[PDB]
Amino acid sequence: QNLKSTDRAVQQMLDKAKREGIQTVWDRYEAMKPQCGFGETGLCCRHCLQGPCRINPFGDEPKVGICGATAEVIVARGLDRSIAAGAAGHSGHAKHLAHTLKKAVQGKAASYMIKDRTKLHSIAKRLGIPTEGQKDEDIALEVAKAALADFHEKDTPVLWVTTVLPPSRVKVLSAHGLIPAGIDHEIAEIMHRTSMGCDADAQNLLLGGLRCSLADLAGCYMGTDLADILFGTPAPVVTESNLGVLKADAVNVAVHGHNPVLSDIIVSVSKEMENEARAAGATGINVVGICCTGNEVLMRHGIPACTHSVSQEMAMITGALDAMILDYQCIQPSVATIAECTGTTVITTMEMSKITGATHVNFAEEAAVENAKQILRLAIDTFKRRKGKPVEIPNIKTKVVAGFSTEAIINALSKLNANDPLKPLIDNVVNGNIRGVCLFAGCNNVKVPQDQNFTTIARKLLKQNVLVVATGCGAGALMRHGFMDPANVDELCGDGLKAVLTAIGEANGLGGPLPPVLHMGSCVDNSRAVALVAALANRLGVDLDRLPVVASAAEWMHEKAVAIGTWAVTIGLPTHIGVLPPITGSLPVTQILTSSVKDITGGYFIHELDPETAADKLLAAINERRAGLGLPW
Amino acid sequence: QNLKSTDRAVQQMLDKAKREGIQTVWDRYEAMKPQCGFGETGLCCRHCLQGPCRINPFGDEPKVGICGATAEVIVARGLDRSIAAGAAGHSGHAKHLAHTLKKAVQGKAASYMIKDRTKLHSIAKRLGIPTEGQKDEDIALEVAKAALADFHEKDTPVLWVTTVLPPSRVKVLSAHGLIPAGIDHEIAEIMHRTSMGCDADAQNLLLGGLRCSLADLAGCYMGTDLADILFGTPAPVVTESNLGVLKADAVNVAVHGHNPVLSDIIVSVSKEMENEARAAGATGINVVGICCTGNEVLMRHGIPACTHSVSQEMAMITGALDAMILDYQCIQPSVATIAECTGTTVITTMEMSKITGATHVNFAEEAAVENAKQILRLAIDTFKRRKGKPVEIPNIKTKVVAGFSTEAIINALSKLNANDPLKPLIDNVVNGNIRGVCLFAGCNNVKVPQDQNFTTIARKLLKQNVLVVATGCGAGALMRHGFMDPANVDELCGDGLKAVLTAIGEANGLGGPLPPVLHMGSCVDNSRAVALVAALANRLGVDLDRLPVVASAAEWMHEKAVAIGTWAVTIGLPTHIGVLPPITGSLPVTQILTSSVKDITGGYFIHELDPETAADKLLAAINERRAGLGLPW
Numbered sequence A, B: 001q002n003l004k005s006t007d008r009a010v011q012q013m014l015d016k017a018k019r020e021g022i023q024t025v026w027d028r029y030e031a032m033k034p035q036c037g038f039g040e041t042g043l044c045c046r047h048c049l050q051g052p053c054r055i056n057p058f059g060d061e062p063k064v065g066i067c068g069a070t071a072e073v074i075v076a077r078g079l080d081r082s083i084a085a086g087a088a089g090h091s092g093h094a095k096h097l098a099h100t101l102k103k104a105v106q107g108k109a110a111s112y113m114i115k116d117r118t119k120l121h122s123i124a125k126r127l128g129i130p131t132e133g134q135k136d137e138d139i140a141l142e143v144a145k146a147a148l149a150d151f152h153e154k155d156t157p158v159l160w161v162t163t164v165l166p167p168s169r170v171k172v173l174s175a176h177g178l179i180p181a182g183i184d185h186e187i188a189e190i191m192h193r194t195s196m197g198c199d200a201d202a203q204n205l206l207l208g209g210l211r212c213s214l215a216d217l218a219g220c221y222m223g224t225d226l227a228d229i230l231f232g233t234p235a236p237v238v239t240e241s242n243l244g245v246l247k248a249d250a251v252n253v254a255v256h257g258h259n260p261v262l263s264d265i266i267v268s269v270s271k272e273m274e275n276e277a278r279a280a281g282a283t284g285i286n287v288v289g290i291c292c293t294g295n296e297v298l299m300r301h302g303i304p305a306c307t308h309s310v311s312q313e314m315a316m317i318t319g320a321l322d323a324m325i326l327d328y329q330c331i332q333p334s335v336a337t338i339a340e341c342t343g344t345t346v347i348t349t350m351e352m353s354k355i356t357g358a359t360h361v362n363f364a365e366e367a368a369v370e371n372a373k374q375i376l377r378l379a380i381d382t383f384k385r386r387k388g389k390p391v392e393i394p395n396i397k398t399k400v401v402a403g404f405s406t407e408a409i410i411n412a413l414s415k416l417n418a419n420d421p422l423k424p425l426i427d428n429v430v431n432g433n434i435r436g437v438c439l440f441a442g443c444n445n446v447k448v449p450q451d452q453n454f455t456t457i458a459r460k461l462l463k464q465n466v467l468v469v470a471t472g473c474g475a476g477a478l479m480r481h482g483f484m485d486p487a488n489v490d491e492l493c494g495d496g497l498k499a500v501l502t503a504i505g506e507a508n509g510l511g512g513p514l515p516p517v518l519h520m521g522s523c524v525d526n527s528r529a530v531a532l533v534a535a536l537a538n539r540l541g542v543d544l545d546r547l548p549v550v551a552s553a554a555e556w557m558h559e560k561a562v563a564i565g566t567w568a569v570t571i572g573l574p575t576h577i578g579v580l581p582p583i584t585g586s587l588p589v590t591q592i593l594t595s596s597v598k599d600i601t602g603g604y605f606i607h608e609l610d611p612e613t614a615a616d617k618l619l620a621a622i623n624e625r626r627a628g629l630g631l632p633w
């Protein structure tokens, strides 16, 4: 089971699932082997009904698609559609938050409000929206209108790209025609250009894909901006993670998915419903998080994280998960089937994301509190049904310090330099105490033993004084293995990095260092890392492709993650990926994405399946950036 | 070669290609066999990097996707993405025409203008745009603004759906939540809901797909509306078709693709350039059409159609094709490679549609005339290079009467009844002279011997007094086999249908019948068939699903065609398809699309690979509609 997951609570539940005959994601992976090599290499196309077409990576025919599409066209078209799909997820999430903010300030949904007014004003100023002498509700209405306007062509480009990156970076992207014109406009154009008998030039196709990945970045940044306005900007918090946060005697309710418009209300309402839970024989409602909507409420409220990504079924196998409340993205639909065994009530809430066999509750922001009460009451009913039954909650959890929004990081730094908060960080980059910065992002993937790449790479970088930040299920992997417990700084961190984490934490009234890894939030909160790196670039007067900053999507899976990796490259970052995407069937495409894209954006993908080798390559990329700044390394 | 194409000019060029060693689309198809069965059945998914996943149609594992996606979810998700891609093509085409109209009436591109002012005003009234006392350029500016607004969410739904269908049909679709909210909005939502861990309910997924197909219908109807304003509404015209329209002694220039913003200018400018062509030793510029941009200029100007779809490479094999001017969609990228053998100059013109090895000329509407001159001058240079060389143009062509826009059809009918032009058609439906109406639409497909399904089905329906209309490459197949020559009415048409075609043609100053098949234009001009059928429904006071009207995509290929077939079903039409889409791996999905969708929209797919059986099934569907109206059959 150690070959399936490095997480000991997950291993325990894999043993329980096995002896109870519950098929898991790892079992379904085993039943898929050997997977199709044409698909694995990218050399397959089904974009018209003359297909399916395939191309042998080596040997004799077939060598070309029926319409004449070459290997490099087929591989680039498939990759572009993955980017467009990821953009569509992040921008659907952002669009739903824009409508929620608009409804809230139109009096249409009283459950929602402007919670962070400083953030609202700072966003309005960044967009050029006048604030002076304006009601907050009219400023927010204009911000919401600007958000929805970035989805279509207008007389400006997408502002959640052009106003969030350094001007030199915007200029470089504009010169290559990479600035998106509208978020859903770019998604549709990808789908058009990749359909049969359209774009058939690998370089042209991939340039389109880089532009669509920036539409994804805009969606991410919009999503973070809007969630902070509505629900509050995160600040440092303390909580726990892994299956042991479930409580046999409570109603255990998991919020799962990505959009917290729902889950944030669940958090609030569950508090009110406690006496109603106590009347059923429970201690109260224990809300726990799975995946990114779990990160959202962990970041803002300290809701403990139960599990993530590939291991999500394991929370149900405990037998103590009374309900799992779904919005959309990264939900294994298997949960609807597994629930018939474990008794969990699986509830979908979004019209475009239903699962056969799950109970659906039509959430509407206009009725959010009423919907949450109905949903929580199903969970209390479920708890009563397992009264007195035995559950197996692994007694395994870690301490998690999180909540490191970019604003929080800057505020924390401001305790060392009030008027120039970025300078203490750059000072320690220059003198070597901080070798560089690495963002860990993206998913787990059943192909990689769970968390193995994240932890192996992180340990090596932390020993080499790299400042490590993480989001999404990369934050999930590191949190479940103790990388967000400040008690582990001595074991994990090089002396230079330890000195810096200690100096900052002590100045922030803690007597102890910051944690070894800074948790920057959900998958859309990769935009927070952009904001920090962009602020560093502007403070240093250089573009992002000169900073000692890299990213690693060490175990990535989702089309969303493919989009994030692509815009990390497009904004100028060396970007390691730990599962090969379907590009190896075309050497020219692989060559563009791993080498020659350097000449366009300054970033590049680093393909490396072996995590020890990946860490070496990431250090080499960081150290080459140091050399380009004339720094020692 | 008869097994590859039923077209005798194509067979001749297949023999030439074979003895010259030029690989064709049929050769590349042969090199693909046996094609992958998982892809053919729909039972394959690559929507995340844990894939590729497949499901055995029968037998043992794999039985389910790694994430838990079932056969019915995987099949519905793949189909939804095909619909979204088709919508993206038709709506990209429409969007480009909306920007062209906007530029033209802003003084930004003098090559373009309001050519059809009656159409502009009728569209403005249908949209509710005030015309009274307004400059034409301001009315058109408002129409163009309304077109671009339908691409995104706003306070109205997509008007190019809700204002073009009968109100009872709109009410039925609204009740099932099928009315699109915005064209690119629906495309993005499909891409989101079909990404991993999102929508996992076949019925929910397919309902989303029906709504996205209506976004495609809107794109088609917008494209037709805008092209008619800019370039003129078609009226009856006479021309020729097939390879024999090439002329050994002329500069032969093929316009190929879909959007005529380019090709319409080429037609105009080539006339001016004739003396410059004569100076090179040619008789002048012989502009000919391939695919839908060929249909556009055939419809408006009588440009002869050279070939279509699967056989497009054959025009080059003659050795007389001096240039082929491309915009986007359905262009086999093989043409760039074949041109190195045949000497043809292949020129791309659109930024998002390039082909490696082809010359690119950056067309802009602001510079349309200058660009066309540069492009035509490359063609004249190419003609000079083959001076005195021998070419092989098959001496094969047909007479084509075309130009049957819905306005033209109504005007033609108005000669039998001035104040009630639809009534003579309905009269002959009621008395049996016209059994029903069949629209032939969509592509050729290398899997089907070229044109075999279209002609076999058409002959049987015409013998049974069905009024047959056609668009796109269905019009192309019927035109190349003489179905648009009125001289063939005696041979082809039942006595009732012949009487009606004769009565109409004679009243329109022709001494002869209308042609056996009415050519209604390009693929986007399927919207014209909608307008006619909607007018018939409104005149009869019934919904479309009560009319004796069916469609047949007899040899379909493109994602665009999948979208068209799906909205034909969604607006209430029995819709035959002659190549199986990847749905047979899921019986529940097949059952929805062929039977139970009847209960939602009244339309349904008719899957039938055998064209003789298909014609029987189409007649049965028509006759069941007749019975529901209490008509004899």
Ligand code: SF4
Binding pocket: A045, A046, A047, A048, A049, A050, A051, A052, A053, A065, A066, A067, A068, A069, A074, A195, A196, A197
């Ligand atoms: S688009 Fe070309 S390569 Fe793809 S399935 Fe169709 S014929 Fe094959």
Ligand code: SF4
Binding pocket: B045, B046, B047, B048, B049, B050, B051, B052, B053, B065, B066, B067, B068, B069, B074, B195, B196, B197
């Ligand atoms: S989305 Fe599910 S079925 Fe598709 S590739 Fe990923 S794991 Fe496999």
Ligand code: FES
Binding pocket: A036, A037, A038, A039, A040, A044, A045, A052, A054, B036, B039, B044, B046, B052
């Ligand atoms: S041939 Fe297996 S992915 Fe298509």
Ligand code: FES
Binding pocket: A036, A039, A044, A046, A052, B036, B037, B038, B039, B040, B044, B045, B052, B054
């Ligand atoms: S297994 Fe062949 S289409 Fe994927």
Ligand SMILES: [Fe+3]
Binding pocket: A290, A291, A292, A308, A309, A330, A443, A473
């Ligand atoms: Fe996740």
Ligand SMILES: [Fe+3]
Binding pocket: B290, B291, B292, B308, B309, B330, B443, B473
């Ligand atoms: Fe075509």
